[PDB]
Homo-oligomer: A and B are copies of this chain.
Amino acid sequence: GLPTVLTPGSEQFLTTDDRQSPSAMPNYEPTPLIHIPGEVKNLLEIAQVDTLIPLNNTTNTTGLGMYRIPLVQNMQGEQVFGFRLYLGDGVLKTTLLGELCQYFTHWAGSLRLSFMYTGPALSSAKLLIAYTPPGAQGPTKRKEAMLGTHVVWDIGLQSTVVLNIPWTSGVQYRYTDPDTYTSAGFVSCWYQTSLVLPPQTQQTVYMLGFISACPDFKLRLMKDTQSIHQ
């Protein structure tokens, strides 16, 4: 018959080698597909949905308290919160971006943060939300934070602010795993003014933090997560 030559790799098993194969059930007729709502085509359709960030993951915060960021009266210029911007082992670890990014090695594109105020309708505050690009430290003072990318958020009828964190990397892709070379920098929030509640009242009010991907979001090279312990 036709002369052939076998090449290296003959009879190997390869996890990702898409090939044809014989059917075990030669004339089987599959069950018809009825219309089902919520069809998913791409993981990046999911990455764009907002989920909560456990920003208050401090010790002694067992329960839903991890998703509540406290604000207090008469405090000004102080830091509300801050964190190192990882999509791996940071505060974003358990968010959907976290969970999706843990299945990929390379991350690129813009992130979206969003905060929602849940205090009294009669209360008010202005908050500064800022992003500090790679190479910088801290910030430790508002005077430093204000030099990065930032938004000043006025509490009012519209209860949610959206901060789109631009892609500022000089490297086309960054790692999902923590890696000094591709650090994404920091996120922080400061009291622009102060929290003001009605006269003679004293309360702590909270914000809820959210995260989602921007349309310009890229993921490459799939890998197993570290969320499985057996």
* B3 lies within 8 A of A8 (CB): no
Docked complex Cα distance between A18 and B1 (Å): 10
* B1 lies within 8 A of A1 (CB): no
Tell whether A26 is near chain B: CB-to-CB under 8 Å. Answer: yes
* A22 lies within 8 A of B11 (CB): no
Tell whether A4 is near chain B: CB-to-CB under 8 Å. Answer: yes
Tell whether A36 is near chain B: CB-to-CB under 8 Å. Answer: no
For residue A20, which residues in chain B have a CB less than 8 angstroms away from its CB? 1, 3
The binding surface of chain A is classed by DSSP as loop
For residue A136, which residues in chain B have a CB less than 8 angstroms away from its CB? none
Tell whether A221 is near chain B: CB-to-CB under 8 Å. Answer: yes
For residue A172, which residues in chain B have a CB less than 8 angstroms away from its CB? 31-32
> What is the 8 Å Cβ interface bit string for chain A, positions 3-41, against chain B (1 contact, 0 not)?
111111111111111111111111011011000000000
Q: Give A99-127 interface residues, CB cut-off 8 Å to B.
A: none
* A28 lies within 8 A of B173 (CB): no
Docked complex Cα distance between A26 and B4 (Å): 19
* B16 lies within 8 A of A8 (CB): no
User: Closest residue to A17 on the B side, CB-wise?
Assistant: B22
For residue A5, which residues in chain B have a CB less than 8 angstroms away from its CB? 1-4, 6-7, 9-10, 19, 21-22
Tell whether A141 is near chain B: CB-to-CB under 8 Å. Answer: no
For residue A19, which residues in chain B have a CB less than 8 angstroms away from its CB? 1, 3, 5, 7, 22
* B8 lies within 8 A of A7 (CB): no
User: Closest residue to A3 on the B side, CB-wise?
Assistant: B1
Interface hub of A11, A173, A221 (most chain B Cβ within 10 A)? A11
* A25 lies within 8 A of B16 (CB): yes
Known contacts A5-B9, A6-B6, A7-B4: A26-B18 contact under CB 8 Å: yes
For residue A13, which residues in chain B have a CB less than 8 angstroms away from its CB? 8
Docked complex Cα distance between A14 and B26 (Å): 12
Binding site for B on A (CB under 8 A): 1-26, 28-29, 31-32, 172-173, 220-222
A-B pairs, 10 with minimum CB distance:
A1-B3, A6-B10, A17-B22, A6-B11, A8-B13, A1-B4, A3-B7, A1-B5, A3-B19, A4-B4
